[PDB]
């Protein structure tokens, strides 16, 4: 529970997702309440390999889908993400955001902050599925508008979240190198200088 307020999504996916089948606390929390957050943190750290085992094919969530179908989280979002189909993935984003994220106290505090993580997940999956593709071809395939396509990719690419190349002359999108040797060493620059800052600052304080 405390991992949801501090925006963890990593260590919370190793507990609420993979666990025993009951965890009924009665007055505090219920079974359907804890099972709802399983699809929250499970879509961040767990890759597609664990989505088809501890999420989809997990017997704990199979009984909840046939019981309460109004969640539209552990079922609609997981099937659309596993199929990598943006056509059916879009309408399940607004339905889940309204009836799940907003009412819950530990969710609506994130809300669009958690929505930004789900959208960049499907854009990264399709990015590895092709090299060069026309913008009008993808617009007519998955049913996405051209005007709203530039605004979706404009909140990520400049932040170095996803590497993509788009040629507006021919209206095509390219694929950059997802992982490179220099990109890994750039993260060690801030981590290396971040440690040396504490060693120098706290070292001079005690003297």
């Amino acid at each position: 529970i405390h991992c949801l307020a501090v925006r963890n999504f990593k260590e919370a996916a190793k507990l609420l997702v993979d666990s025993l089948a009951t965890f009924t606390s009665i007055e505090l929390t219920s079974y359907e309440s804890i099972a709802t957050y399983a699809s929250v943190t499970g879509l961040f750290t767990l890759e597609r390999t664990d989505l088809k085992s501890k999420v989809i094919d997990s017997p704990e969530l199979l009984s909840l889908i046939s019981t309460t179908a109004a969640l539209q989280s552990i079922s609609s979002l997981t099937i659309s993400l596993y199929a990598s189909d943006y056509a059916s993935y879009f309408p399940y984003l607004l339905e889940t955001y309204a009836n799940v994220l907003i009412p819950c106290k530990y969710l609506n505090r994130h809300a669009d902050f958690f929505v930004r993580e789900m959208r960049r997940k499907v854009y990264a999956q399709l990015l590895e599925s092709y090299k060069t593709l026309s913008l009008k071809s993808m617009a007519s395939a998955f049913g996405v508008s051209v005007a709203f396509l530039d605004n979706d990719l404009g909140k990520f690419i400049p932040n170095k979240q996803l590497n993509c190349v788009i040629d507006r002359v021919n209206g095509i999108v390219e694929t950059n190198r997802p992982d490179n040797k220099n990109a890994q060493y750039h993260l060690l620059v801030k981590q290396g200088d971040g440690l040396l800052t504490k060693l120098q600052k706290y070292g001079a304080a005690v003297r």
Partner: peptide, 27 residues
């Protein structure tokens, strides 16, 4: 809170529902 909680979002609210307009018309 790096590049997230400071600027929040302030987007994708009324523009998300507006996408279904062009989807159910031009098609």
């Amino acid at each position: 809170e790096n590049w997230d909680d400071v600027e929040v979002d302030d987007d994708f609210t009324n523009e998300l529902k507006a996408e279904l307009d062009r989807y159910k018309r031009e098609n």
